Design a binder for this molecule. Structure first.
Ligand code: NI
Length: 341
């Protein structure tokens, strides 16, 4: 049965709660974003109202084949009424179409659900600043002090300069970027822009990108692999065997590959800066691991919460074990005592 952390008190609303069949009481199911864990259980067979962003709506319609009658897209940054209750969607700074949801309860309680988010100081000057928030449903993916990582901009700069240097040294080099869902599109779009190229990709991947309301998208991407010197491939193929295999398939038009694996955090964040990063190499193939995160670091998450001063915090990530919940509670109390709420 549907856990209390996916339920919104004193409404019949739920959030990211599609895997438990019919939730008793629920009149409206909210989807923060189009990642499989959050959408899990939704399909063309679902027949209840789904509320979400316009991008998330495009994806449900075209990829999942959810029938149009059940998709209720809502605009960003606008007060809307859903089943008699005032709501706002805000940009989560996660993947394309990802939202936080602000719920104004009839009794006067205000609740923020972050979905998945990368906390940022621009969120301190949104509609969030206009009133007190009593309860926060928080993306605790990286809620521990060892989780640091560079800015997205630092990582992109590094990728751009690296790719440009390699292709100017060898204009028969191919650049490859690994991918498994939506998110992190700026990595491959910024590399292509510096090389003057479109990004080549499979039919299924192109169809996904064509849903994302990216301006001038037709001028940036293509299914013609031949005509393009940046290719997307599944993350599972970003290894020496997979990359040599792909290189054979391209028909002798390239003689070298530079590949990037965008990742979350891995243990080598604790010593290395972005400038010190060096690839793994076997013959004419090099693989760079670059820590491009679309979740809050510890410092970013702490800042956000200390600004917001919630009366109660409800974690939505790593809640399955008592040790994790206990550890997280410890950090929330520290934050509260330091800040004075
Ligand atoms: Ni996500």
């Amino acid at each position: 049965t549907c856990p209390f952390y996916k339920k919104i008190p004193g409404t019949g609303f739920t959030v990211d709660a599609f895997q438990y069949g019919v939730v008793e009481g629920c009149t409206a199911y909210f989807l923060t974003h189009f990642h499989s864990d959050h959408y899990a259980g939704l399909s063309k067979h679902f027949t209840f109202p789904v509320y979400c962003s316009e991008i998330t709506g495009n994806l449900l319609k075209n990829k999942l084949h959810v029938q149009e009658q059940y998709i209720h897209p809502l605009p960003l940054d606008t007060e809307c009424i859903v089943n008699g209750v005032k709501v706002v969607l805000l940009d989560a700074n996660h993947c394309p179409g990802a939202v936080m949801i602000l719920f104004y309860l009839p009794n006067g309680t205000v609740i923020l659900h972050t979905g998945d988010f990368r906390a940022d100081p621009s969120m301190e000057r949104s509609l969030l600043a206009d009133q007190k928030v009593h309860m926060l449903y928080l993306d605790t993916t990286y809620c521990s002090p060892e989780y640091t990582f560079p800015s997205q901009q630092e990582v992109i700069r590094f990728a751009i300069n690296t790719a440009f240097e390699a292709v100017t040294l060898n204009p028969h080099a191919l650049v490859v970027c690994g991918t498994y869902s939506i998110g992190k599109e700026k990595v491959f779009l910024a590399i292509a822009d510096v090389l003057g190229s479109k990004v080549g990709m499979s039919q299924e991947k192109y169809k996904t990108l064509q849903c994302l309301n990216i301006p001038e998208i037709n001028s940036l991407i293509t299914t013609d692999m031949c005509s393009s010197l940046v290719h997307l491939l599944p993350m599972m193929q970003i290894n020496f065997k997979g990359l040599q295999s792909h290189l054979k398939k391209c028909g002798g038009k390239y003689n070298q590959i530079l590949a990037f694996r965008p990742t979350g955090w891995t243990h080598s964040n604790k010593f290395t800066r972005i400038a010190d990063v060096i690839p793994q190499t076997k013959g004419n193939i090099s693989i760079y691991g670059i820590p491009y995160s679309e979740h809050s670091s510890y410092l970013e998450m702490k800042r956000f919460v200390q600004w917001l001063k919630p009366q109660k915090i409800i974690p939505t990530v790593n809640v399955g074990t008592w040790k994790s919940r206990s550890t997280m509670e410890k950090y929330f109390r520290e934050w509260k005592l330091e800040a004075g709420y």
